Write a protein that binds this ligand. Sequence first.
Ligand SMILES: O=C(O)CCCCCOc1ccccc1CN(C(=O)c1ccc(-c2cccnc2)cc1)C1CC1
Ligand SMILES: CCCCCCCO[C@@H]1O[C@H](CO)[C@@H](O)[C@H](O)[C@H]1O
Length: 262
Amino acid sequence: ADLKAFSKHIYNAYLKNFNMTKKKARSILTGKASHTAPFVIHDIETLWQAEKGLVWGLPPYKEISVHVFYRCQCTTVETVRELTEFAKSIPSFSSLFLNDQVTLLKYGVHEAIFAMLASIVNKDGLLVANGSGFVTREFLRSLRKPFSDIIEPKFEFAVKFNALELDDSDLALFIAAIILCGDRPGLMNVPRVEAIQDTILRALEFHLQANHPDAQYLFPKLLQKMADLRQLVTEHAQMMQRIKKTETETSLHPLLQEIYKD
Ligand SMILES: O=C(O)CCCCCOc1ccccc1CN(C(=O)c1ccc(-c2cccnc2)cc1)C1CC1
Ligand SMILES: CCCCCCCO[C@@H]1O[C@H](CO)[C@@H](O)[C@H](O)[C@H]1O
């Protein structure tokens, strides 16, 4: 009965802390938010114009693939910051000891990052710089290995995910469900976390039958997506290890070194 209130507070935490909603993202991608459109980045020259000021600091320069890799890090570290504030706005999360909070964010943020990335992605590319840019998938494909191999799987997941047609209120509960996961290694108060997760799942199962009355099997499809996200992030972490090993001139932000340390 109270699930509607617990879930409303999660929605508010979502709207207060995340830079862009799926709502705002889809209106830009479809040309319904402004009479100015995102600047399309599809090669070195458009990339250079975007950096020069059209659209928008980092470690010293090295090459274009690496440059784009540093822009991906900057966006992930920033999204880690929004996920930390989102999580702390969930009272039951803030009741956990600080070390359990860190353990859940450490192993959950990338799963949650890649779930939210679908919102800014279509089959042809994705938005950057708060919607001022659009970077083409074909450009990101043209990057040299291993940087194109770490990017392209996220588009595959994103286009299938977007076929579920979730709105921001669905996503807020789904993200909370990914972060409050009782399985993370070294978790201290596991029973307390599992109870929170279960509450969010029940809130989510209720929310879907109200918001998507005609979509059947959506809840078990979303549970499957959470299992798919765990595997996508396992493969992402393996690809990050190879970059650490073979791309020695490429630096990793220190906060990402901590997440990938284990
Ligand atoms: O392991 C880590 O934590 C760091 C390593 C991540 C490496 C893989 O990152 C991927 C993969 C697929 C899709 C999106 C991203 C990065 N993201 C971007 O929004 C993003 C930002 C800027 C550009 C960009 C800017 C300028 C010119 N060209 C491209 C493109 C994409 C989302 C945060 C995930
Ligand atoms: C900002 C929230 C995201 C934080 C994710 C980074 C977690 O790094 C971990 O921080 C712990 C210190 O508490 C260390 O003990 C671990 O060795 C380290 O892996």
